[PDB]
RNA sequence: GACCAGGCG
DNA sequence: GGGAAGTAGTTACGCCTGGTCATTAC
């Protein structure tokens, strides 16, 4: 009943096939009569199809929307050369005898090269290399070895002109033009026994078919006509080109029939050849392209198949889909990571077909009664026959009574359905994942905040697309293969990609720092807010005045970890390494130290968890942050995805609550240095500027040994740049030193939550040297960047150095230098992406078809083995331990801890 | 002494007297006064094929702006009438024709040749010189600056192209060879010619000429212009002994091999290969005459001057080789000239007149040949008058101005005016664009330049690929017009300069150039430049003349052409500025103006050339004896929108760029006459406010009279997640009291068109019988005349105007319903209805819809310091925290967004705004002169608060104070026009493309999203094959095709007898069905359109 | 339906 | 022959707004 396409073969259409498959011959160069009906015999004849409503195609009956169209043909007066096969005709002509049809080779060479063509035929490059040798060696021979006959060279001039050089005398030669009616007759005489030597195939590719004699006409449906509201008709370019071709052919035929001098037909022939050549391809080399009435060059058959809007990359590879939606996104941290908020307006438009069964008849019948305007409802019902019926206010109460097994109902979206969520550009495979629907009143998509990194999204105007699968197989595939919790680990480097971000780290540090303590109400409220299942508070840790019990942050945080976890490492907050060494020694000597001893030697730089109890350290980016998280990485590899999702949700909500009520802010006084720091910075800048004038004067009086790389000037520039960079670093050191951990910006920067030290030293100290493309500013007037400096100046401040901070303001020259430096980032971000995307396109188009077989080998589609074992050990990088095939020490330690306790 | 606060008074008068759109009005006035006459005089006259007839052109005049009704009468026109009725604001043109019979001139006659569009508020517009109340009575906003056209009811503006110098000589060097290429562009009557002379490894100089493919040698082309003797070449080029040796090395290729006519034979052989022998000489002479340096003339007599110029170019080329001249820089602003309206319009008028004259010639010749000489000579005036068709000019000018496609291949000359608010329009009227291609990187062109100081804004630029290639003029920038050159040349010749012909240049003598061409030599140019500039300061000559010198090459440059960009400065002599306190007083009282200050010699204009010799001091207390000029006001180097940011020197450059670009999108009261004004889209803010912290420039430029944005009470605090990642939280009660409320407008248009014959449209309530008749519910509030009643609620798909088209020929006797309806996803209330008549008698109606919009989730809010975001959550008032002094925040911003962007200016502005609100007086924040931070902190400490800006707040839920003091202040905020109500979109089923039967494109026509190729690659990478099948095929085009199994072609199914058979081969049993996408069937059909035959081999399963 | 110009991530 | 020198082929993905077309001489 239903078949599938197994293979496709290519060839060249013979005139017999064109004349047989055609349904009508076109003679009249017109489309529509005065009334509006197609003109009989014109390029819009009814036999080739119908488009306008109210007309019937007499070839196959049908209507204006169900007729696929049928072909037509034109009988050319005289043959013309196909532009696509122009070069091949030249190669064939200059490598065969002029009057017998045989090839310019002997029998021994024919056998030798047939024995070579027999093998290595499935390949492309080798088969092309073989053909070139035959052409090269047969081009030189000037006499046919099969028949005694003289030969002459042939010159080819683009696009479709062939010249023959013949000797009028020994020293006098004249060039003769080969008209197509001679080339076809010459080509017709080549025997098929030597065609494979030329690279053709006798069954379905014959040389004499490259010279057209009859030209097919595409059907009406391949060139639709649009009726404008003004009453005038709009027609496709192909129609105009065909009309021109038909008119020229008719005039040439009439001139030939009526008799005329040779100079007339030999010019009409050239005009017709030009028209056909432009019709097939409008960008052929060395020919003025055809121009429309508006001056725009016409689009033709060749242009429809190439480019970013062609039939291949425009419609076949990617096409517009039906069930989709688009809107802005807004943050929502109160939903789990695998859910998405959907506006009630969209949820009432997109529909999910469902088949009524015995376990869901009641719900479906209830939904149908609500109609299409209340939220839980349906828009259409399908009877078993196949009719589609629209639910209306006068039909619901009777359609809900006819519902029975076998029917189909297009209901609305509910909580629990699964949809596809996408953000463009789709850079890697994690840009599309499946989420569970959750309906919201307002009109924006809601997204959890820990899911932002893989999407690379930010809430400043971004938009995202949503797709709804329709068939049960698609829903099952999305549910099993595309779940969010299944993509916590990134396949690029085998590390966590979904994790905490921004406040999720600052709140954790505020919760787990030294000296943090909480009252009873705060603890109960935070534990209830996070969602933890608890019915009894643990023992209090310390008593305030008036005997108020208090709990520490570590005790509260320990309630989220699994019971048998154990790990230790060092985080970014390590300042003095002589205090972590004692803890490492204590752990090493006795594998399970007494908790009191550990609590006595606690330090924020050393994280240590013992049997689910956090004994020392503080939360940081290395705890559960992206591409650095350790606890999350251990959890996802030892307990499952579900436990990781639960832990992620609970920890995020707890940290958000902690940061919300304790208070977190930054102000203008966060960059206020004492006077001595400013004095030290000023002295540093002064000495740095002073020790550059000495170098400048040294270069001015010779006395300077150049580095062997380049001339003296480049060495001077390099020395100056090194001095300035060292000066900036030295100045930033004291600014780092004089700002304590109490400052909120330092907290927010040293924990990896946001920013870095460079921002702090730029805000509280000098900006430093600006540069473009790695060299100092030199564009401007002759010898000086700006008009306010003396010509021929090489001073530090005269070529880009800025000695001011963002807080203290900038002088106009420094402002101009800063703008000059800052333009580079914008232009680089504008420029790089094009070539990056081109390289990614090439790479993805080269390595697409490589699978993994059941034997563990990677094979190309033809069957060639590329790798005898994927990678070199058959280990998936996504499932690897940070690149390593297996982490031995972790397994040893965990097993020893499990047994020796 | 003079303090920086005094120079501001002088700087104000510049804007108070000149304006902001001078570069358009001045250029258009110059074009009107002189361009038309020059263009007319270029042609001379008409030479028809009549034996004894010829016409000579006279004068040209421009009439009053008027419109002609179709019934015959002509009546005055006003801009608002043209805007409403979709007409064109133009004025007629008149020309005098002098008939010549047998060589004797007759009495002149005057005919109308067409109509010319009029720049608004120009020297010929009806609004010139009117008072404010006169403009009010005419419906115009007095704040409107003018300077744009009105084409077919739409407003067009001409941007300025940043072309290269028109006649200079630029040298360079490429690394792919050792070529020392010097190329020039030559302009004559709008024709651009590129000429290059260079050397290579052979050491022989070669020349490239348009239409001459081969690089003919230098001596060959020199001898074509005469001066064949070998002494003449060396005398023409130079006199340096090394140059003499190089030239002796060069001559041997042509010194004793060719003569003057032999080189002509060579050139004829090249330009006309294998043609007639006599043809070659004429072709070569023509090419030499009008393709080699056309700006020197096309007469054969100018060949000696052409040879001299070519020798000078070759001398520069060879001087580069010996390292006697550094290579020129293309990005230096002394080598670039701007194109204004007065030159583009000149080119367009030239081409249109060139068409018109040929049309007139053809008409006269045909009429005389047909009717006979007696009719022509019976009434010569009537014969001339009735042979002119005045449409070829008007239509060709109007279409070019409307579409924006200039003749010569240029695109984007004319653009639609941006009318979102005041700043957008004012900034759009001062654009500068580059003609380079956008896609290529162009690393050198996009970079900032030192010469841009004071001429181009360094921060206002687009963000996408257009970065760097589109720029905006600074505030001090002043464009220049052109003065006649013959007077300047004859003045320059009268103070010691000897002509070039009389004396040959030598290394001990200075050279003198005028507009790029060499005119003579002098023995001392250092005194000459001083004399010329002193004469300019005195007032003897015009101020558009700039003189500069280079002592390395001993050259003096004089410029008098238009297109240069200049800035004003204060003259400094003997270490003392020439501006005194009494001058400032006189300016303040009103006795003295800016033009008088220019005339008296206190202030002079400098272009990029004169600034080479200058040494400018920045502040009045930094001047010394070495300095030659004093900067007027450093804060004015910024553009117009980039000047809005308070304390712009405390921010990072990208944030300033973002703020400047984003300042052109905020909502606010744009223009006073928005009610009458008819626009496709519009916006209005209910309660606009003046910023508390502002720059003094905005008061001067008139921004305070049309503000946009309101002041919010902002607290920097981290809330419960809903304000993370650049999200903001807004109070609800503040919204309920009118904060950030706005209204949206939209206009619909309908026309009662006339068809061929008696067929016509009609305004009418459609009957139920007519085809396409919608539901009777939609025609709910239409009056019986077919128009909707104002102030009536309308929903989506409701009908505004009822129209019934004539029947469509196959349906007979059935009118078609083609009513205009509201967009399917909009909602509002009808505001006004206008009935009028078009320019050809047809009726016309315009309807506007008013919609109220309140802030909600997803709306975009943004300050002027580059911080943007969307509303994340709306909070009830009782849940927000409150300060212990009684203040409740109006907005919450995440503290995580501050450190990364390093926008300290926002904190400075918050402190300043709170201080200003407490003190009852606004705070000045004008760039480098505004109030310092420490003063504001001390004032805040004095007023009773804390100097750090922090306060104590109480939690809005628990009810107890937080552990940390919270920064809080007042910050100006703006509401952008990217609302969420215009972005929501969803599709289930709808219309499809005709050709490919795939879903349509666009939100406006119920289109669908595109599943691009990387989405397919992502789906492949996941491995979901069935998902790919569903998304790419099931939800898109899908069809069933009958395939013949025996031969592989597609079978044919007939509905007439339900029989299926293969047409090419007689097979009727092996026919099978295959399921495939329709696009692939179209691909197969297109492949079969060419001679390629694809054969299909089926398989089971 | 195709072009042109300007914006958003 | 191995040096020019002259073709020939490419240059990220979505989305939004508006404006113009789609001959003419007799
Ligand atoms: Mg973004
Ligand atoms: Zn049919
Ligand atoms: Zn032979
Ligand atoms: Zn068949």
Coordinates of N, CA, C and O in Angstrom, one line a residue, chain B residues 23 33 73 79 302 329 384 400 423 606 669 678 728 739 814 897 914 950 994 1006:
Chain B
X23 N 22.8 73.2 8.0 CA 23.5 72.5 6.9 C 22.5 72.1 5.8 O 22.9 71.8 4.7
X33 N 19.3 79.6 -5.4 CA 19.8 80.8 -6.0 C 20.6 80.7 -7.2 O 20.5 81.5 -8.2
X73 N -8.6 74.9 -11.7 CA -8.2 76.0 -10.9 C -6.9 75.7 -10.1 O -6.6 74.5 -9.8
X79 N 1.4 73.3 4.4 CA 2.0 71.9 4.7 C 1.0 71.0 5.3 O 1.1 69.8 5.0
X302 N 43.7 72.2 -23.7 CA 44.1 72.0 -22.4 C 45.0 70.9 -22.2 O 45.3 70.5 -21.0
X329 N 47.1 59.6 4.6 CA 46.2 58.8 5.4 C 44.8 59.1 4.9 O 44.4 60.2 4.8
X384 N 6.2 76.1 -30.1 CA 7.1 75.8 -29.1 C 6.3 75.4 -27.8 O 6.7 74.4 -27.1
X400 N 12.4 59.4 -7.6 CA 13.7 59.3 -7.0 C 13.7 59.8 -5.5 O 14.4 59.2 -4.7
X423 N 13.9 64.3 20.6 CA 15.3 64.0 20.4 C 15.5 63.1 19.2 O 16.5 63.3 18.5
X606 N 38.1 76.9 12.1 CA 39.2 76.1 11.7 C 38.7 74.8 11.2 O 37.9 74.1 11.9
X669 N 5.8 63.5 25.4 CA 5.0 64.4 24.6 C 5.9 64.8 23.5 O 6.8 65.7 23.6
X678 N -1.7 63.4 11.6 CA -2.1 62.1 11.1 C -0.8 61.3 10.9 O 0.1 61.7 10.1
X728 N 13.5 44.3 37.3 CA 13.1 45.4 38.2 C 11.7 45.1 38.8 O 10.9 44.4 38.2
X739 N 1.5 56.5 37.5 CA 2.9 56.5 37.1 C 3.1 55.7 35.8 O 2.6 54.6 35.7
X814 N -22.4 40.3 -8.6 CA -22.1 40.1 -7.2 C -21.0 41.0 -6.8 O -19.8 40.8 -7.2
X897 N 24.0 44.2 39.6 CA 24.2 44.8 38.3 C 25.1 46.0 38.3 O 25.5 46.5 37.2
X914 N 18.3 63.4 45.1 CA 17.8 63.5 46.5 C 18.1 64.9 47.1 O 17.2 65.5 47.7
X950 N 22.9 56.3 52.8 CA 22.2 55.1 53.3 C 21.1 55.5 54.3 O 21.2 56.6 54.9
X994 N 1.2 30.5 -1.6 CA 0.6 29.9 -2.8 C 1.6 28.9 -3.5 O 1.3 27.8 -3.9
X1006 N -0.7 36.6 10.4 CA -0.9 35.3 11.1 C 0.1 34.2 10.6 O -0.2 33.1 10.3

